[PDB]
RNA sequence: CUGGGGGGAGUAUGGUCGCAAGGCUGAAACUUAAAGGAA
């Protein structure tokens, strides 16, 4: 049907010296008109995943794990916190 | 007197200073600003504080050795 | 062990955000590398 | 209550009341030139008058008469004064694009707030005596933190000239009425515009907030005086 | 096995001298009779900094937190970073690293991240202009405290890159049998996230106190603009007095807070400096600890340094008692042979120190 | 019986104009015919 | 009115000493006026 550009101009005419309304409206139209960072399946009788966010948390997790192992790698001491 | 007071280690350090007349805090103890203002309105108290190679190395080490003896 | 080539980059939200604000800088300064009609 | 202090365009100050007739006393030669702004202290016994003869003066109430005792001459035409609501600061707005914050107890010259870029109208000090507003003919009001004199916002309102700006009693919300027939309600935390009130027709010269409760009156150039309450 | 200390006084000096000497210590009764007894977070993070700097040192905090066991190890250095807490600035953690700094395998390149200044601690300008020259003439030659950004309290957000890169064997033996003639008096007035006129007000106050002495006064001025300013408003002033024929220096600093007049702070730091000049002789009252620490870990010779009467205090002699408690050495205070003043000359025979971590 | 005090409030834009620009920026890290 | 390095034409530079870039100004602690610039 109608274009994403036409619907985007309609969404901007919809949303229209306050700041937080513009922060909210801009974040809303960005996460609405960005469809390639969700994943949609087809209901055989729909947003089923958030690929980029899942990827960035899965790689930041192992990034801090890798830096922790690189910090541990040639240590021999350690504080023993019994508190 | 003062060295025997310092290394006599059954008396408190303020007692050493008292019978002669804490390091987490880095900057030392100063007076009140008003006492220091009336003390240092004058300035004249401190106006006089204001205003061959092988044989050379051997001379430096023998200079240190004679300093060692004359301070022993 | 040593490995031959760098793996294919995973496209996360940080790299899409960096790429989008690159595009926004170019597109509000009209820094467009188009073909020019002779 | 039942007693009015006032200063006039020429070098005169005047005192009136509510029960009796007009003049308790006038003070001819209260200032050499045009008075511009006065302020009581929160107990009321001591008031401050700043005038276009490049001087401010202090006056006490002796018994119901005015006692001039001290006078601070500046280099420039002072055109607004204010004290803190807890007798603490004296903020005075000069014609030379700046304000100065003094200590009342020392005339100490605490701070100089600078960078407004036109001569600067009404000040206000908050109830906690921590946050000041600064209005001017630059079409913007600046929020300043009074502890170090550091600016917080420089929000652009009011496309002609902000004549007056006043806090609420107990909050950090404030009002500003301007020379383009509009009063505006702001908050001092998110610095949004809470409301854009649009009832006047011409230049809104003054506004005054209630001491408690917080209903605000505004009075303008179209000879109108109007009340604003809560919903 | 363990040399035992009591109380949470001189905590950083105890852990530092235990790392230098290689002796296992216990510190017992860390504020045990208190409502929240035990170690505090800033000294726990100092222990974490010690574990970062050394290698093979085992620190063993108890259940109650009121006693710590430090069995030291080899100083190895390396590049690191330290996110020190808001309870203490970066000076509280870079001051005890200047002792351990030239005696490691790999050179110190650490950047501390936190609040820059405090009333009761060392600043960036304090560490640099006061405490680096005494190391610079005790034997190190390449040491630098860089500010990448600085953060005034309470939110801070300033980073400080301590880099020492002369790994000496031992500090040289000091011989300062004179009072150094003060050639100039300079300083630095800094301000972050406030107006640039406060710096000139501070400078004018300090120099109107300083104007009656017949030397030369020069105070440099830096306002910090941008992301380099940090997360909070702040301003402060640090003066040094500079003996240029030998390199000695005597400093005094402070910072302003909420409600402080900059001319007041400038004249206060100026008068505090002149009192440090009065109560000083060849060191400062705060440069004196690491001066006599480097004299006691010098060679196995006699090193002598002049001090005056008023520099002796409970802090100075509790320092001397801790030095003798760890590695069994005494200072010998001999008086000078001229009597217009009361100055001792402290002679310390240094222990036979070398750094054995640097690879040959 | 008037108590006449004075005031002086010089502004310091030159203190930002003489910040670490070149010199302090470099120093604050240590025939024809 | 005595004092002198070493040819001519060039080339390169991970060395040392300098000088130099950014990026609309106002305008930063302030996303801030007027005015100007550019297109």
> Does E140 fall in a domain?
yes
Q: Is A59 in the D-facing interface, judged by CB distances under 8 Å?
A: no
Side-chain-side CA neighbours of A2 within 13 Å: the count stands at: 6
* Alpha carbon distances (Å) from A78 to D199, E30, E73, E105: 71, 20, 11, 19
Residue D150 sits at the vertex; the CA angle it makes with A23 and D100, to the nearest 5 degrees, is: 130
CA B53 to C1' G2, whole Å: 38
Backbone angles phi, psi at D131, to 5 degrees: -135, 125
Establish whether the CB of E198 is closer than 7 Å to any nucleic acid atom in strand G: no
Tell whether E168 and E133 lie within a shared domain: yes
Establish whether the CB of A18 is closer than 7 Å to any nucleic acid atom in strand G: no
Query: What are the strands, taking DSSP E only, across E76-157?
Result: 79-82, 108-114, 143-149
> Does E220 fall in a domain?
yes
Chains A and E form CB pairs within 8 A to the count of: 40
> Does E251 fall in a domain?
yes
CA separation for the pair D140, A24 (Å, rounded): 25
Kindly give, in sequence order, each residue whose CB lies less than 8 Å from that of residue D153, ignoring residues fewer than 6 positions away: D142, D143, D191
Q: Please, which experimental method was used? A: cryo-EM
Residue (of A61, A42, A40) closest to A50 by Cα position: A40
Q: Nearest by CB to E225, which of F12, F18, F19? A: F19
CA separation for the pair A10, D95 (Å, rounded): 49
Tell whether E186 and E154 lie within a shared domain: no
Kindly give, in sequence order, each residue whose CB lies less than 8 Å from that of residue B70, ignoring residues fewer than 6 positions away: none
Backbone angles phi, psi at E240, to 5 degrees: -125, 150
Resolution as reported, in Å: 3.7
Sheet with strand E68-71: strands edge to edge: A79-81, E58-61, E68-71, E25-28, E3-6
Tell whether E191 and E285 lie within a shared domain: no
CA separation for the pair D1, D40 (Å, rounded): 13
Chain A interface disruption, residue of C7, C8, C12, C18, most A CBs within 10 A? C12
Nearest nucleotide (CA of D153 to C1'): G30
Tell whether E84 and E200 lie within a shared domain: no
Tell whether E138 and E83 lie within a shared domain: yes
Chains C and F touch, using 3 or more CB pairs below 8 Å:
no
Q: Which residue has tokens 């400062």?
A: E284
Establish whether the CB of E229 is closer than 7 Å to any nucleic acid atom in strand G: yes
Tell whether E204 and E346 lie within a shared domain: no
By C-alpha distance, the chain A residue nearest D158 is A17
CA separation for the pair B44, E213 (Å, rounded): 8
Q: Do F8 and D75 touch (CB under 8 A)?
A: yes
Report residue B35 CA to chain centroid gap: 24
CA separation for the pair F4, D71 (Å, rounded): 5
Chains D and B touch, using 3 or more CB pairs below 8 Å:
no
| Cis previous bond, D227, omega within 30 | no
Q: Is E234 in the D-facing interface, judged by CB distances under 8 Å?
A: yes
As a three-state string, the secondary structure of chain D is CCEEEEECCCCEEEEEECCCCCCCEEEECCCCCCEEEEEECCCCCEEEEEECCCEEEEEEEECCEEEEEEEEECCCCEEEEEECCCCCEEEEEECCCEEEEEECCCCCCCEEEECCCCCCCCEEECCCCCEEEECCCCCECEEEECCCCEEEECCECCCCCEEEEEECCCCCCEEEEECCCCEEEECCCCCCEEEEECCCCCCEEEEEECCCCCCEEEEECCCCEEEECCC
Q: Nearest by CB to F19, which of E197, E200, E223? A: E223
CB atoms under 10 Å from CB of A42, counted, come to: 6
- The encoded tokens of residue E88 equal 């203490």
How many domains are contained in chain E? Answer: 2
Kindly give, in sequence order, each residue whose CB lies less than 8 Å from that of residue F7, ignoring residues fewer than 6 positions away: D72, D73, D74, D75, D100, D109
Q: How far is D194 from chain A (nearest CA, A)?
A: 8
Tell me the three state secondary structure of residue E99: helix
Tell whether E202 and E266 lie within a shared domain: yes
Is the Cβ–Cβ distance between D22 and D4 less than 8 Å?
A: no
Q: Nearest by CB to F20, which of E196, E199, E222? A: E222
Q: Which residue has tokens 């340094």?
A: E305
Which of E255, E274, E293 represents a domain boundary (last residue)?
Answer: E274
CA separation for the pair F12, A59 (Å, rounded): 50
By C-alpha distance, the chain E residue nearest B65 is E301
Residue (of E111, E133, E143) closest to F29 by Cα position: E143
Kindly give, in sequence order, each residue whose CB lies less than 8 Å from that of residue D58, ignoring residues fewer than 6 positions away: D46, D47, D48, D49, D68, D69, D70, D71
Report strand pairing: D35-40 vs D46-51.
Answer: antiparallel
CA separation for the pair B48, E87 (Å, rounded): 42
Q: Is D196 in the A-facing interface, judged by CB distances under 8 Å?
A: no
Tell me the three state secondary structure of residue B23: coil
Is the Cβ–Cβ distance between C12 and A52 less than 8 Å?
A: yes
Nearest nucleotide (CA of E223 to C1'): G29
Tell me the three state secondary structure of residue B58: helix
Q: How far is E162 from chain F (nearest CA, A)?
A: 12
Query: What are the strands, taking DSSP E only, across chain E?
Result: 3-6, 25-28, 54-55, 58-61, 68-71, 74-75, 79-82, 108-114, 143-149, 158-164, 175-176, 184-192, 217-224, 234-242, 249-255, 302-308, 331-335, 343-349
CA separation for the pair D121, E120 (Å, rounded): 42
CB atoms under 10 Å from CB of E325, counted, come to: 16
Kindly give, in sequence order, each residue whose CB lies less than 8 Å from that of residue D4, ignoring residues fewer than 6 positions away: D15, D16, D17, D18
Tell whether E305 and E341 lie within a shared domain: yes
* Range 57-116, chain D: CB under 7 Å to any strand G atom: 113-115
User: Can you give the CATH number for the domain in which E245 is found?
Assistant: 3.30.360.20
- The encoded tokens of residue B44 equal 């004249």
Backbone angles phi, psi at E285, to 5 degrees: -65, -20
Kindly give, in sequence order, each residue whose CB lies less than 8 Å from that of residue C14, ignoring residues fewer than 6 positions away: A56
Tell whether E265 and E280 lie within a shared domain: no
**Class of residue D21 by CB neighbours under 10 A (exposed 0-12, middle 13-18, buried 19+):** exposed
CA separation for the pair E43, E242 (Å, rounded): 33
Q: Nearest by CB to B64, which of E120, E267, E301? A: E301
CA F33 to C1' G10, whole Å: 25
Backbone angles phi, psi at D76, to 5 degrees: -155, 160
Q: Which residues of F touch E226 (CB under 8 A)?
A: none
- Secondary structure letter of residue C10 according to DSSP: P
Q: Nearest by CB to E196, which of F12, F20, F28? A: F12
CA dihedral E162, E168, E169, E171 (to 10 degrees): -80
Establish whether the CB of D138 is closer than 7 Å to any nucleic acid atom in strand G: yes
User: Can you give the CATH number for the domain in which E336 is found?
Assistant: 3.65.10.20
Q: Which residue has tokens 């100026």?
A: E270
Bridge partners, residue D49, by sequence:
D38, D57
Chains C and A touch, using 3 or more CB pairs below 8 Å:
yes
Residue E47 sits at the vertex; the CA angle it makes with E111 and E322, to the nearest 5 degrees, is: 115
What Rg, from alpha-carbon coordinates, does chain B have?
22
Tell whether E26 and E107 lie within a shared domain: yes
Helix (H) / strand (E) element for E262: namely helix E262-278
Report strand pairing: E184-192 vs E234-242.
Answer: antiparallel
CA separation for the pair E172, E302 (Å, rounded): 10
- The encoded tokens of residue D128 equal 């906690």
Neighbours of chain E (3+ CB pairs under 8 A): A, B, D, F
CB atoms under 10 Å from CB of D229, counted, come to: 9
Which of E218, E251, E274 represents a domain boundary (last residue)?
Answer: E274
Backbone angles phi, psi at D90, to 5 degrees: -125, 105
> Does E27 fall in a domain?
yes
List bases in chain G with any atom under 7 Å of a protein Cβ: 19-20, 26-34
Which of E249, E274, E299 represents a domain boundary (last residue)?
Answer: E274
> Does E84 fall in a domain?
yes
Tell whether E270 and E280 lie within a shared domain: no
Backbone angles phi, psi at E69, to 5 degrees: -120, 115
Q: Is D133 in the E-facing interface, judged by CB distances under 8 Å?
A: no
Nearest nucleotide (CA of D112 to C1'): G29
Q: Which residue has tokens 């003798």?
A: E324
- The encoded tokens of residue D131 equal 């946050």
Tell whether E236 and E88 lie within a shared domain: no
Establish whether the CB of D117 is closer than 7 Å to any nucleic acid atom in strand G: yes
Nearest nucleotide (CA of D137 to C1'): G33
CA separation for the pair E113, E156 (Å, rounded): 9
Domain hosting residue E25, numbered range: 1-177+275-355
> Does E360 fall in a domain?
no
């Amino acid at each position: 049907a109608g274009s994403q550009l036409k619907n985007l101009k309609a969404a901007l005419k919809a949303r229209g010296y306050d700041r937080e309304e513009k922060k909210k409206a801009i974040a809303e139209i960005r996460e609405e008109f960005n469809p390639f960072e969700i994943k949609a399946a087809r209901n055989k009788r729909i947003a089923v995943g958030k690929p980029g966010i899942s990827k960035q948390i899965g790689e930041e997790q192992r990034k801090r794990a890798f830096e922790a192992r690189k910090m541990m790698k040639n240590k021999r001491g350690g504080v023993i916190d019994k508190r | 007197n003062i060295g025997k007071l310092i290394y006599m280690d059954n008396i408190s350090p303020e007692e050493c200073i008292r019978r002669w007349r804490d390091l987490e805090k880095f900057v030392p103890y100063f007076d009140t600003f008003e006492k220091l203002a009336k003390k240092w309105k004058s300035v004249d108290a401190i106006k006089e504080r204001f205003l061959t190679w092988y044989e050379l190395q051997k001379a430096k080490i023998s200079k240190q050795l004679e300093i060692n003896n004359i301070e022993y | 062990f040593d490995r031959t080539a760098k793996p294919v980059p995973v496209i996360t939200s940080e790299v899409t955000e960096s790429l989008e604000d690159m595009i926004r800088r170019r597109i509000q300064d009209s820094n467009f590398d188009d073909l020019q009609r002779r | 209550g039942l007693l009015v202090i006032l200063g006039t365009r020429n070098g005169e100050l005047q005192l009136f009341d509510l029960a009796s007739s007009s003049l308790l006393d006038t003070i001819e030669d209260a200032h050499d030139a045009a008075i511009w702004s006065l302020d009581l202290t929160s107990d009321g016994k001591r008031l401050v008058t700043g005038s276009a003869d490049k001087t401010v003066k202090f006056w006490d109430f002796k018994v119901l008469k005015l006692h001039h005792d001290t006078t601070l001459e500046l280099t420039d035409d002072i055109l607004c004064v204010r004290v803190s609501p807890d007798d603490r600061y004296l903020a005075i707005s000069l014609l030379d694009n700046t304000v100065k914050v003094f200590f009342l107890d020392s005339m100490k010259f605490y701070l100089s707030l600078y960078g407004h870029k036109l001569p600067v109208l009404s000040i206000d000090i908050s109830f906690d005596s921590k946050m000041i507003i600064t209005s001017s003919a630059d079409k913007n009001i600046k929020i300043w933190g009074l502890d170090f004199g550091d600016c917080h916002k420089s929000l652009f309102a009011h496309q002609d000239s902000i004549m007056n700006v006043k806090f609420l009693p107990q909050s950090h919300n404030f009002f500003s009425c301007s020379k383009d027939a509009v009063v505006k309600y702001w908050d001092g935390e998110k610095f949004e515009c809470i409301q854009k009130l649009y009832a006047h027709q011409s230049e809104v010269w003054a506004l005054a907030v209630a001491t408690d409760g917080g209903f605000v009156v505004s009075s303008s150039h179209d000879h109108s005086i109007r009340i604003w309450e809560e919903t | 096995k363990y040399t035992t200390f009591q109380g949470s006084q001189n905590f950083r000096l105890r852990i530092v001298l235990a790392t230098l000497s290689g002796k296992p210590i216990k510190i017992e009764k860390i504020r045990s009779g208190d409502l929240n007894p035990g170690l505090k977070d800033y000294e726990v993070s100092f222990l974490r900094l010690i574990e970062s700097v050394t290698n093979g040192s085992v620190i063993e905090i108890s259940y109650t937190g009121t006693t710590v066991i430090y069995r030291p190890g080899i100083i190895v250095g390396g590049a690191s970073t330290h996110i020190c807490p808001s309870s203490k600035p970066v000076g509280y953690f870079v001051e005890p690293m200047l002792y351990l700094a030239p005696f490691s395998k790999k050179k110190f390149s650490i950047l501390f991240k936190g609040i820059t200044a405090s009333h009761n601690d060392a600043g960036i300008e304090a560490i640099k202009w006061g405490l680096m020259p005494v190391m610079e003439k005790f034997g190190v030659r390449e040491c630098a405290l860089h500010t990448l950004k600085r953060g005034s309290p309470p939110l801070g957000g300033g980073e400080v890159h301590l880099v020492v890169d002369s790994l000496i064997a031992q500090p040289i033996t000091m011989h300062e049998i004179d009072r150094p003639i003060i050639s100039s008096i300079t300083g630095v007035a800094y301000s972050t996230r406030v107006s640039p006129s406060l710096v000139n007000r501070m400078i004018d106050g300090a120099k109107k106190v300083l104007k009656n002495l017949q030397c030369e006064v020069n105070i440099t001025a830096d306002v910090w603009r941008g992301e380099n300013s940090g997360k909070s408003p702040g301003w402060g002033i640090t003066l040094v007095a500079q003996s240029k024929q030998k390199g000695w220096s005597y400093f005094a600093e402070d910072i302003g807070d909420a409600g402080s007049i900059p001319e007041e702070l400038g004249e206060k730091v100026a008068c505090q400096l002149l009192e440090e000049i009065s109560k000083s002789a060849a060191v400062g009252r705060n440069q004196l600890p690491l001066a006599i620490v480097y004299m006691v870990i010098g060679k196995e010779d006699i090193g002598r340094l002049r001090i005056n009467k008023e520099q002796i205090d409970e802090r100075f002699i509790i320092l001397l008692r801790d030095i003798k408690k760890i590695f069994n050495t005494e200072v010998f205070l001999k008086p000078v042979d001229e009597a217009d003043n009361e100055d001792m000359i402290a002679t310390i025979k240094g222990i036979g120190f070398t750094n054995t971590s640097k690879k040959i | 019986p008037k108590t006449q005090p004075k005031v002086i409030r010089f502004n310091g834009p030159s203190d930002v104009y003489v910040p670490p620009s070149k010199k302090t920026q470099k120093l604050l890290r240590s025939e024809n015919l």
